[PDB]
Amino acid sequence: GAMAPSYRVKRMDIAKNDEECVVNAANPRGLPGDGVCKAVYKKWPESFKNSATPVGTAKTVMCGTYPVIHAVGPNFSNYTESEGDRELAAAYREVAKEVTRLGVNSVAIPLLSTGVYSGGKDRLTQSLNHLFTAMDSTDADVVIYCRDKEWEKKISEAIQMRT
Ligand SMILES: NC(=O)c1cnccn1
Ligand SMILES: [Cl-]
Ligand SMILES: [Cl-]
Helix, strand or coil: CCCCCCEEEEECCHHHCCCCCEEEECCCCCCCCCCHHHHHHHHCHHHHCCCCCCCCCEEEEEECCEEEEEECCCCCCCCCHHHHHHHHHHHHHHHHHHHHHHCCCEEEEECCCCCCCCCCCCCHHHHHHHHHHHHCCCCCEEEEEECCHHHHHHHHHHHHHHC
16 A cells, blocks of 8 residues: 555546556547547557456456556446436446556546547536545545646635545
């Protein structure tokens, strides 16, 4: 574990993270995809061997000794708000299990289902709160990666609020 486990946020490409492992915002079929998933495919292509996994689950594949945790959030175009919310909460619990099993002291994580799986809605608060619910009982340093300046401010505010 980290000596004083923390949350931080950075506005940059998760493929350039400074953490001991990465969470991919994966699709269920282990395809290169777009956004975070395409950047992860270009940086750690070996991690996409047998990475396919259902919605609401996480499956880790090593690229050398560097763990890539493929987490499949729901596509809110396809799910009801209720079922999508349940699967988004489940994906993050599976991420906490994997981070714990790996024994890492740090993890780089994107906000699941906030991009092309958002169903055109702002899900910053919904996705971040499910991230906190899952990761608060872990002792890894968590670094959240985002791309938008307004999102960075709102994530930073939510972290600082809890102290
Ligand atoms: N996570 C992000 O960087 C982000 C930015 N703008 C909309 C949705 N997600
Ligand atoms: Cl960058
Ligand atoms: Cl997404």
